[PDB]
Design a protein around this nucleic acid. Structure first.
Length: 74
DNA sequence: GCCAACGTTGGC
DNA sequence: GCCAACGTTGGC
């Protein structure tokens, strides 16, 4: 399900066609650490909430969006 | 001390 | 030149 790692999955809190992936680091000091990426319907990768906001503009209100889980968490 | 957010780099 | 992957750090 939603906490499964290494697998792109639907993010239903965003507009249609957005997906999310959790990727675990392998090499280097920061190994094991978990990061989250988003993919637009066009397939571009997004690495931060501010980056999503810049791209989505007023088509979404991300004010309560939790980047790590992809849920709206008021 | 942490980590959100971003900059840099190696490998292609 | 691209981009996955790691390193870096200002703001908290």
């Amino acid at each position: 399900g939603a906490t499964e790692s290494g697998k792109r999955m639907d993010c239903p809190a965003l507009p249609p066609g957005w997906k999310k992936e959790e990727v675990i680091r392998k090499s280097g000091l920061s190994a094991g650490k978990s990061e989250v990426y988003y993919f637009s319907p066009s397939g571009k990768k997004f690495r931060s909430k501010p980056q999503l906001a810049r791209y989505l503009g007023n088509t979404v209100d991300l004010s309560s969006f939790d980047f790590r889980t992809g849920k709206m968490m008021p």
